[PDB]
Amino acid sequence: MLSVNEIAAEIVEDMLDYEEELRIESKKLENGAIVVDCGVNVPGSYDAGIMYTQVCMGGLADVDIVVDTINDVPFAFVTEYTDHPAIACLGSQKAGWQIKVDKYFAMGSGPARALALKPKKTYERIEYEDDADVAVIALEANQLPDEKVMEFIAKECDVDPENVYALVAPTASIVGSVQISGRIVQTAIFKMNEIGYDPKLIVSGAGRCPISPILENDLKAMGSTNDSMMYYGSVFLTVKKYDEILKNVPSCTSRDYGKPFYEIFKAANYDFYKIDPNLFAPAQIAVNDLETGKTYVHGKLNAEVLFQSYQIVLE
Amino acid sequence: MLSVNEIAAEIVEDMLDYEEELRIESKKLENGAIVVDCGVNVPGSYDAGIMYTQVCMGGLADVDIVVDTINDVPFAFVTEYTDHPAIACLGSQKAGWQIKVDKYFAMGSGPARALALKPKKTYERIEYEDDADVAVIALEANQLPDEKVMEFIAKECDVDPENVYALVAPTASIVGSVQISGRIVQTAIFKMNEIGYDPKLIVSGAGRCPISPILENDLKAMGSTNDSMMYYGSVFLTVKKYDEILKNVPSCTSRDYGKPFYEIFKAANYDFYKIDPNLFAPAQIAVNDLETGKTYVHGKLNAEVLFQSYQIVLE
Amino acid sequence: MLSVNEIAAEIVEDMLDYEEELRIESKKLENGAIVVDCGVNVPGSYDAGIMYTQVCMGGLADVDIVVDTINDVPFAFVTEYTDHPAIACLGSQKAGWQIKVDKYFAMGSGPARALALKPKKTYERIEYEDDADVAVIALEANQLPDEKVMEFIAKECDVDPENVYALVAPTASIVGSVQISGRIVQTAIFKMNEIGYDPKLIVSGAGRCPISPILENDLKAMGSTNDSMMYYGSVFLTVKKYDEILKNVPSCTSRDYGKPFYEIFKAANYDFYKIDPNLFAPAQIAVNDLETGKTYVHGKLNAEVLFQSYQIVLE
């Protein structure tokens, strides 16, 4: 068995060895839980961003940064791949756990999900459950969790609070930008399962996605980081059997596609904050069908929307 | 001295530590030989593909995967380089050892070739021979070799069978796609030597090549993996002294160039050749000549043929 | 505290463990100094080039090579990033120490600069000084340093000569090409400071730059290596507050921009005092401002001049 919590815990332990290099800071709480600040009150780093992503993917993925250009403008990009996309992306990475402890709220991502079984149906659909006595969660938040939050996470995971780790970074931070574009494979996997395709048919996935510049607040960053994937995220996927339904994976097949997501979200304040869930999806995919030996291409890139998203100013 | 077998054996031991993660499986045979299935009865993985390639290159190259686009369509790519091209590519990686042990027949690649001296003339040309008590062979085949096959390989290498490793993957597998695109440097070096250029004059080489989707059988995969290098593989090379003959390195200088190789292979009826041997060659090269300080560029990319080879289906 | 000397010493120790593989040679002098030839009387290698660069950047950066294309022609590229740009690039990588010991001339880069404080004002500007009893220097020289040269470096750094390491390569070598394209982030950071922008405001930098072919002598190589960055070097940087003056970062804003540096230098009668110092600068930058959330783009790529510089011969 592959234990996403045990594998990710090793990477957290590595982060703990290089805190200053990585520009992160941890604290051991009075109940023994370890809270790793990756960008709330510290700058974080590109490499902290990478490691946060690897942790989110339960250590079952390759994640690297390469610098390249869009229409000549240079950006850092995530390039990543995994041969365990159902476990890495659905059973671990997806921010699928609503943590609510009195007044704290955060969406939880990462290996701890596979212990708490959050949400229940995901683990049934992918046929995975972790068995570990360590739990590792990643939180996107502008506040660090305290002893009571960590206690709750540990009880939900059936682990002692001394054996729980949390990585935390806000949306608008380097680690936020890296870890969100680092979801490019996930967006594909999750959208495929959402439209009815069995994620157990997915053999592997490989993805490229620009890392958003850091915008001036968490709400703008929510927009540009989602946009990295929706307008400029590319995925090569391998599956056992193709289904024609996969034409509906790309975000351009959503009624809500066309503007930066920040603009979509602002416009929705006037309609009960409702937005097509299918919008959250990769820009372009190629699907290599093992049955027929054909590779079906769907979607499109959109540098023009991306540059609006990114608040690019040209001369 | 650099021992391609000893260096590669360290890589194989690493594979053995991460079998489940890499989606491979090994067996230690009665005679002690270690046989590592990388894609016959197991899925393998992008990372097993990289390690298989590193092993073929006698651990004397860098091999990585980077996601990128061809006419907007995303693919995984091999990016690779080596400062021992003669030894890594000709003395090791090239599939130059025909293994036929009555019923079992495979083409053998990798460091074992440098103990068995297969073929003889290669090792005289590059002035290399390995001295090691361990042998590592990579087999492109759809069956795992038994005690008798490994005893044959051991004997040819003058190594006890308990000190022999074999990596095995079929042509149509992820390891097959990665490892064959991984020969991008090798194809250039091999073609250079074939047209009479002394490979001992080659200082280093760096290459990029897309990783073929997996087609529906080994025969179709033979075509598309080869096409990756012939129609879309690029190599930057450094040489001590340039020769005008190097203009005939690229595949497009062959009389047989122009159709997906599968069509070429079963359009002159055969199961080889006359097919022009010179066809097996990189698409495009830049050769930096240390003597004159100039860099000569030859060849061209053909995405149109690659997309045919790859059985791409656009909307 | 981050000690650039102690961190870089670990990398040098890793180089010493793989000399034959990296094609380098070291010698321990009679005073105990360790001189590592990366390219004077040995070929060096792509990997020795990467480690040389990592050392120049005090172990505080990531540096990798990818193969990609410029107008179809393949080159090896450096991709790199750092979350300590002031220390890694100003405090360490910049070749800011002029060494003259009798008739021996060398340019000193890397972590020993942060002990000798060469030049004084840089360390005041970035508010960094190292404390280490090991010194690590990188020398761009066409001759290996002897006992007397190493004694001078040791005394300037207040270290015992037995605790000094030097890496050495000439401009025209693979290491020299890799390491100079390896200065792509540095050239942006240095240029910023030179035009009056406080390097303490710079959060991080990421850059890409092609690696020059090796030209026929050090003079030519000085030209093509510089041109790599000036004509085809791209950087994405993040800063605390923008300043309109950053429009003047790219080389194209220099009065001397436009032809290969070798031609500029010849036309100046080999006198840098006759060349605009603001020429030494990246080709194109994108500057993400944390204050406004905007990303400002400046500069341009120039493949035509690059290909002249590189002494490219097309068919």
Quick one: which H or E segment has residue A65?
strand A62-70
Rounded Cα–Cα distance for residues B54 and B63 (Å): 6
Chains contacting A with at least 3 CB pairs below 8 Å? B, C
Q: Could you say which of 3.30.1030.10, 3.40.50.10260, 3.80.10.10, 2.60.120.650 is the CATH number of the domain covering A45-95+170-315?
A: 3.30.1030.10
CA distance B145 to chain A (A): 25
Q: Is the distance from CB of A56 to CB of A97 less than 8 angstroms?
A: no
- Taking an 8 Å cut-off on Cβ atoms, the answer to whether B286 and C73 are in contact is yes
Rounded Cα–Cα distance for residues A252 and B33 (Å): 53
Both structure tokens of B252: 């497009």
Give the residue from C229, C129, C125, C117 showing the smallest Cα distance to C177: C229
Nearest to C174 among B62, B204, B286 (CB): B204
Give the single-character DSSP code of B88.
I
Query: B312 phi and psi, to 5 degrees?
Result: -70, 135
**Among A295, A298, A301, the residue to mutate for chain B (most B Cβ within 10 A):** A295
The pairing of strands C34-37 and C25-28 is antiparallel
In a 3-state reduction of DSSP, which class is residue B234? strand
Both structure tokens of C203: 């959060």
- Taking an 8 Å cut-off on Cβ atoms, the answer to whether C216 and B66 are in contact is no
Q: Is the distance from CB of B98 to CB of B152 less than 8 angstroms?
A: no
Both structure tokens of B156: 């040819």
Q: Is the distance from CB of B118 to CB of B134 less than 8 angstroms?
A: no
Q: Is the distance from CB of C208 to CB of A68 less than 8 angstroms?
A: yes
Q: What is the resolution of this structure in A?
A: 1.5
So where are chain C's domains?
A: 1-44+96-169, 45-95+170-315
Give the single-character DSSP code of A279.
G
Write down the experimental method used for this entry: X-ray
Question: What residues of chain B lie within 8 A of the CB of C75, using their CB?
Answer: 236, 286
Rounded Cα–Cα distance for residues C22 and C257 (Å): 36
Query: A97 phi and psi, to 5 degrees?
Result: -110, 115
Q: For residue B45, give every residue at least 6 positions away whose Cβ sits within 8 Å of its Cβ, in sequence order, or none.
A: A83, A204, B21, B22, B23, B24, B174, B175
Distances in Å between the Cα of C270 and the Cα atoms of C91, C191, C252 are 28, 22, 21
Question: What residues of chain C lie within 8 A of the CB of B248, using their CB?
Answer: none
* Total length of chain A: 315
Both structure tokens of A133: 């006595």
CA distance C191 to chain A (A): 18
As a whole number of Å, the CA-based R_g of chain B is 19
Q: Is the distance from CB of B66 to CB of A66 less than 8 angstroms?
A: yes
Fold of C1-44+96-169: 3.10.340
Rounded Cα–Cα distance for residues A98 and C169 (Å): 56
Q: Is the distance from CB of A260 to CB of A227 less than 8 angstroms?
A: yes
Q: Across the A/B interface, how many CB contacts are shorter than 8 Å?
A: 97
- Taking an 8 Å cut-off on Cβ atoms, the answer to whether B213 and A292 are in contact is no
| Burial of B243 from C-beta contacts in 10 A (0-12 / 13-18 / 19+) | middle
Does the fold of domain B45-95+170-315 match that of domain B1-44+96-169?
A: no
- Taking an 8 Å cut-off on Cβ atoms, the answer to whether C67 and B207 are in contact is yes
Q: Which residue has tokens 């298989």? A: B52
**Residue C259: other Cβ atoms inside 10 A:** 16
3-state secondary structure chain C: CCCHHHHHHHHHHHHHHCHHHHCCEEEECCCCCEEEECCCCCCCCHHHHHHHHHHHCCCCEEEEEEEEEECCEEEEEEEEEECCHHHHHHHHHCCCEEEEECCEEEEEECCCHHHHCCCHHHHHHHCCCCCCCCEEEEEECCCCCCHHHHHHHHHHHCCCHHHEEEEEECCCCHHHHHHHHCCHHHHHHHHHHHCCCCHHHEEEEEEEEECCCCCCCHHHHHHHHHHHHHHHCEEEEEECCCCHHHHHCCHHHCCCCCCCHHHHHHHCCCCHHHCCHHHCCCCEEEEEECCCCCEEEEECCCHHHHHHHCCEECC
Give the single-character DSSP code of B51.
H
Query: What order of strands is seen across the sheet that includes strand A34-37?
Result: A25-28, A34-37, A164-169, A135-140, A104-109, A97-101
Nearest to C236 among A20, A75, A215 (CB): A75
